[PDB]
Amino acid sequence: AQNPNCNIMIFHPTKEEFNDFDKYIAYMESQGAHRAGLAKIIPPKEWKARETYDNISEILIATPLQQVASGRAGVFTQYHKKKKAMTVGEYRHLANSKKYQTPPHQNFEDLERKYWKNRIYNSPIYGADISGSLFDENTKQWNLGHLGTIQDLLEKECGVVIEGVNTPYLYFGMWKTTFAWHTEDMDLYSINYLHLGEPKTWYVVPPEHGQRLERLARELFPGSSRGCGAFLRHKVALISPTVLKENGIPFNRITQEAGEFMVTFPYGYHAGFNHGFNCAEAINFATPRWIDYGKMASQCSCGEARVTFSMDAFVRILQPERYDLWKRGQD
Numbered sequence: 001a002q003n004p005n006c007n008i009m010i011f012h013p014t015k016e017e018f019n020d021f022d023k024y025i026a027y028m029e030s031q032g033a034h035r036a037g038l039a040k041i042i043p044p045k046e047w048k049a050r051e052t053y054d055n056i057s058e059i060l061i062a063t064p065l066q067q068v069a070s071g072r073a074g075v076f077t078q079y080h081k082k083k084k085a086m087t088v089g090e091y092r093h094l095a096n097s098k099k100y101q102t103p104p105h106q107n108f109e110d111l112e113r114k115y116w117k118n119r120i121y122n123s124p125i126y127g128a129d130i131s132g133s134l135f136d137e138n139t140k141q142w143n144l145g146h147l148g149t150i151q152d153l154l155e156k157e158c159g160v161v162i163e164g165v166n167t168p169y170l171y172f173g174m175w176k177t178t179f180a181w182h183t184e185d186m187d188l189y190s191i192n193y194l195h196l197g198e199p200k201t202w203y204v205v206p207p208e209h210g211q212r213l214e215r216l217a218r219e220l221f222p223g224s225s226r227g228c229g230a231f232l233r234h235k236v237a238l239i240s241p242t243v244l245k246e247n248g249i250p251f252n253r254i255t256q257e258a259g260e261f262m263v264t265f266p267y268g269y270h271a272g273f274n275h276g277f278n279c280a281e282a283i284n285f286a287t288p289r290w291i292d293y294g295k296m297a298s299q300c301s302c303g304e305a306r307v308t309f310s311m312d313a314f315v316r317i318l319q320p321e322r323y324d325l326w327k328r329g330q331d
């Protein structure tokens with residue numbers, strides 16, 4: 001068995017190997033990359049996502065989200081308070097202000113210490129989930145706006161044509177902006193490209209150990225657990241590496257820098273934080289190996305998780321028993 005310790009693997013494809021996306025994902029899996037739940041892909045030196053980032057300031061962040069924490073430093077939830085619209089140029093200036101900017105630090109480990117010590121005492125503003133792309137249309141390789149769609153994969157594997165679309169999302173971050181512990185919708189893959197700015201630190205639980213994280217979360221967030229049998233789908237709970245280590249939960253960590261891709265694998269729980277002003281692009285995708293994970297994915301039916309239009313068909317075809325209850329949660 002390849003990668004039996006479930007370490008995060010880092011790949012350096014050549015420009016020739018960067019042509020065929022599906023083939024390279026299957027290669028990384030042949031080497032055991034999925035066992036970690038997360039892999040890093042450093043693009044060939046010849047590749048670029050676009051020519052420059054000099055002209056992005058007029059993108060609108062219609063609904064910036066202020067991430068307000070409750071709890072203790074290592075075990076907290078966050079809720080998202082909606083703020084007034086602002087442009088990316090306005091948000092960059094805000095991220096660089098004395099109130100929000102990255103503090104002085106020695107190295108990524110010192111910054112990680114400061115994040116976990118101090119996160120809860122601040123409320124950073126995240127420009128999340130903005131439909132769009134920063135890949136140039138002429139970028140042919142690993143262009144997250146030109147991937148094969150999940151609907152087409154389901155149709156190829158299973159023979160059933162379904163409605164729905166699959167487009168990328170932009171994320172504009174600042175120091176301390178936080179992504180809570182989750183797997184993807186329908187336990188899909190995700191791919192994330194850090195276009196510019198400061199790093200993103202990731203934490204990940206191997207898929208084979210995801211239920212260990214779920215059991216800890218039910219213990220640590222006991223009210224939320226009674227409210228919903230899949231409350232991590234709400235994407236609000238944070239647990240620190242120290243608390244994970246105290247409780248014996250297997251996990252790994254890695255820092256993504258600008259110019260690098262990350263892939264999350266089916267049922268790989270992940271969480272993390274931004275170091276400073278940055279912009280990332282991400283999308284879900286599927287492969288043949290996902291289908292079995294989609295069939296078994298948990299679902300929130302309490303009404304909190306509320307998701308995209310395209311998840312309807314995935315539930316309806318892969319999980320027909322659950323469909324009725326899940327759709328009640330959506331309406």
Ligand SMILES: O=C(O)CNC(=O)C(=O)O
Pocket residue numbers: 171178179190191192200264270280282283
């Ligand atoms: O970058 C972020 O805020 C969160 N991204 C992801 O969870 C992802 O790409 O799967």
Ligand SMILES: [Mg+2]
Pocket residue numbers: 055056057058059
């Ligand atoms: Mg612009």
Ligand code: NI
Pocket residue numbers: 182183184190264270
């Ligand atoms: Ni994710």
Ligand SMILES: [Zn+2]
Pocket residue numbers: 227228229230231233234300301302303304305
């Ligand atoms: Zn729920």
